[model samples]
Target: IVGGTEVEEGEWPWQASLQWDGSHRCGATLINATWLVSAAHCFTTYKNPARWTASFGVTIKPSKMKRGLRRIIVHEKYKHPSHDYDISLAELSSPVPYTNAVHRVCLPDASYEFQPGDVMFVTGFGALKNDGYSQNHLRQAQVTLIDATTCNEPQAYNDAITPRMLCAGSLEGKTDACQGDSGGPLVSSDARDIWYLAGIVSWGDECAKPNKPGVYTRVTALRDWITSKTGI
Candidate 1:
């Protein structure tokens, strides 16, 4: 994460980490005691439920706890490279115990709406810079939502921005999520400080690059698919 900072313990109770082959792979969101939401690309090659672990709380080595996966549900419409519908749900084999450090993020309803320039936060254990080494403790950065129209401009993302996706980052080439931050949550808060899952890290041309903001699977656009898959 560019312009990132370490999170205090339990600060992002809904944050989860996806681990593969004994290493951190991507960020995840704890949707409930039994369900986690992550990027579909994370499991593209090694998707076996048993091969991946979901870690909650204290992402520091030897301190974070892991859970087993019962199954994974990737959106049927998801396509590679294009990253359309690039969301997936992981069902834990057993319910993860809830504590101040482990809780669920709120999913937005169908009517939920946000406009361009809305402020949001993204959390992950990814690199501090583009192509940099990954971090141990989780980190987060503040970003403003970029309008899809401007994001689709040729100079920006070359019309790669789709309706299913949204852009969020700084145009100044300062703050943004980097590699290893995929599958993390783009969270927005209500007037009550209630955070809702606004987006899921998907794809981007580069990290913190001017005119190339980070792309995310718009959570608001996939509410029906998510509900159909999880029945939650």
Candidate 2:
């Protein structure tokens, strides 16, 4: 219900995904019930950790698929062409049992200030038309929000953008969130039904490309590096 706006109970806890058909390319986050949160070049050459899989809270294709990966933890200030601290934290091994659709997805308290264009709602398992084809149910894209000096001066997207990172698109192009909607969650619709996850989807040379805005990774600037490395 993007554009219609509603980040919902907005679940994206630690994100989660690597592959599970439909065509999301790969995404991740689920922060609890075993832990997860991805995007470290999606595991550039981790040699293939069973190709990866950690779906949660329904986004599509869920009748069964809750295996495990068990230990990953990348993010030593992760950096790849300025994907800056790409963020990763996985460890399933075998604990994911919590039903109620598997809990945990609320991390944005501390006064909560995310400003600028501030109109987000980016659910994943992506692909809702635009470039087409990456749909399997879970899909929503309602972007608007491009502060931080137009994503860092020069001429938009300049300096590869930072300030942790938080940009939604539509420089008159259309909509976005491509390549599997990486790391998911960018919620925080200016405070309402309460949806907060402020960025995590990293990388965007051209995912939907309107003004080239679809960069994420600013989960409130890692909120104390994610509660000091998952001490949450």
Candidate 3:
């Protein structure tokens, strides 16, 4: 993530590194013991489940746990050259054992609404700058939700924002999720410390550029699709 700080171990237990060929490629979120949520674009080229693995923990080098993938399910509506409906699900070969360093993130109900300007967080091991190197440690940054109208202004995203997409970060070019962060979780917490999966890192114009906030797959908007596929 850009303009972010390193996260403590177990702080974001649901974060998972979607490794391709034993290397970190993208970030994913644990939605249940055997299911993960990620960006569909991440699998465009490497669609084989055998080539992927989900590693859990703050640091990838010493992952606290790891699991093989059993299946990958990309949304049928997800198309190239467009960012809409860019969500996917992965099933693990075996269920994961919950611990302080590993757990599931709650999925918001269909009726749950997060208003514009709501404070949220994004976690990932992505690049610190555009086309830069990916981090080994997990990082997090705070961002506020941007309404579709503001994000679709001609000067901003120019109507690229869709109902399935959410915009977050500062209009001043502050913290944001960048390359290698795709498929990561953008989460919001309740007063009871329960973290809800709000979005999935999807795409952006650049790494924290002014008027170009990161775009995400809105989890709340696709909750029904997730339940229909994973039955979670």
Candidate 4:
């Protein structure tokens, strides 16, 4: 994440590093004991479950929990070249035991609404620059939700924003999600401080670029898809 700060251990318990071949490749969110939600694009090349693992904890150096993937389910409608419907789900070989540093995030239903300008957070172990190296510690940045109309303006994403996608970042280009952040969670808390998985880091033009805020897969838009697969 760009312009992000290191997060404390157990602060974002649901945050997960989607490792491929024993290395952090993408981010994921623990939606349940054995189910994780991520980006479909992350599995475009590596779809084999045997090559993937999910690690939970703020720091990658000493993960609080790790689980082998037993299944990977990318949205069938997710196609290349377009960012629409860019969500995926992974099932762990075994259920994880919840701890202070390892837990699940709540998934929002379709009716849940987040207005424009609502403050949210994006957390990941992604690059600090446009194409930099991934971090060992988890980082988080505050982002304001941008409406589709503003994000789809000709000067912005140029009509690339879809209902299945949501925009979050500063129009001034102060902070945003970058490479390796894909599939991470964009979380928002409720009045009672219950955090809900709002979005999934998907794509962006660059790191903290003007008018090009980070685009994410809208979790509310894909609530049914997740329910159909994981029943969570």
Per-residue CA lDDT of candidate 4, range 173-215, in tens?
Answer: 9889999999999999999999999999999998999989999
Worst 10 residues of 1 by lDDT: 57-66
List, residue by residue over 16-54, the lDDT tens digit for candidate 1: 888786688888899888999988898888888888888
Give the per-residue lDDT digits (tens) of candidate 3, residues 141-215. Answer: 999999999999999999888899999998998899999999999999888989999999999998899999999
lDDT of 4: 0.93
In model 3, where do residues sit more than 4 Å from their true spots? none
Give lDDT per model, in order. 0.87, 0.63, 0.93, 0.93
Mark the regions of model 1 whose C-alpha exceeds 4 Å error after superposition: none
TM-score: model 4 vs. ground truth? 0.98
Pick the lDDT winner.
3
Better of 1 and 2 by lDDT: 1
Deviation in Å, model 3, residue 198 alpha carbon = 0.7
